């Protein structure tokens, strides 16, 4: 958009897509996996309120990621898996600039990986359906 | 206030950072068993310059970017090849075609999608082969 960098994509081209959108700051990030990746929680700041969004399905157990001050998402990773006919993100995991968190799931598949050497996660986007079919990001110094 | 995406492959070979470029002109993928060396002119505030990483093996496979066409995509993957950790495949797509992979030593894949920005640099380690690579990206 307004020179924004959306890295990304990874997963299966089914489900409907969904978009976050750059947030302003990621308080935290809450991944919702059973034996694939169900969906993700986003609760961040815009333009001064404090907003959460709902992405994938509404099934899955929560692992939240809570980005303490100074801490950003520097980095994401998991695997793109076949689900019953449904080509969706089988394990997830993200890294920050203090801990590296999963990753969350137990459906193994082809793998990605975005080590962020500069720079950092700002939002996300992607598409998703019963379960998370696929997720991207947005990038900024 | 870059950012600086990935570096896949291995930690051989000695580090390369060809910083950002205004405009990348050709690229050059020398690739054999792997990924020998890349080789990419680009040009850089007036100037045009040539950069080489990697070995000197391997056959040339050049992407000449045309008129308003970047790279928006990479993909590729690191393996083993006797002993070294570096790339075995390796490919770009740019927003009119895609090229590659070139290569023929698999591994653990990774992929580069680029939705909205595109790639401007490289950087990464090389030596007799191109151990890892990673991108600049911008708006
Ligand atoms: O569907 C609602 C229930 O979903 C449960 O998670 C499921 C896992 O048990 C199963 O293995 O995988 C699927 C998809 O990955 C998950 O939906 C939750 O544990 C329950 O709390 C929830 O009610
Ligand atoms: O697979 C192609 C079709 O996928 C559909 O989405 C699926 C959902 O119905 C289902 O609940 O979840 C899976 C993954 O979570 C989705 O793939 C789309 O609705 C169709 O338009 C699409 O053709
Ligand atoms: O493997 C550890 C050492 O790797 C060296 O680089 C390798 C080159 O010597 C060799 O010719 O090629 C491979 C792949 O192209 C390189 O990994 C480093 O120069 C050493 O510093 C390092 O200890
Ligand atoms: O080293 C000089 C020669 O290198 C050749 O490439 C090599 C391949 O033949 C071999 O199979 O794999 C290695 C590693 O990828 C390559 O270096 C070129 O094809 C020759 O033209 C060149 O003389």
Not at 81 to 104: D, E, R, W
Request: proline residues 4%; charged residues 15%; hydrophobic residues 35%.
């Amino acid at each position: 958009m307004n020179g924004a960098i959306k890295v990304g994509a990874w997963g299966g081209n089914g489900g409907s897509a969904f978009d976050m959108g750059p947030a302003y700051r990621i308080i935290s990030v809450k991944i919702f996996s059973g034996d694939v990746v169900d969906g993700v929680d986003v609760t961040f700041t815009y333009y001064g309120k404090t907003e959460t969004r709902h992405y994938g399905g509404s099934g899955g157990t929560p692992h939240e990621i809570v980005l303490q001050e100074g801490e950003y998402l520097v980095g994401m990773a998991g695997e793109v898996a076949n689900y019953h006919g449904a080509v969706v993100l089988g394990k997830l995991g993200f890294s920050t600039n203090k801990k590296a968190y999963g990753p969350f799931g137990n459906t193994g598949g082809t793998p990605f990986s975005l080590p962020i050497a500069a720079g950092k996660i700002s939002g996300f986007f992607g598409r998703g359906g019963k379960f998370l079919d696929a997720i991207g990001v947005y990038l900024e110094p």
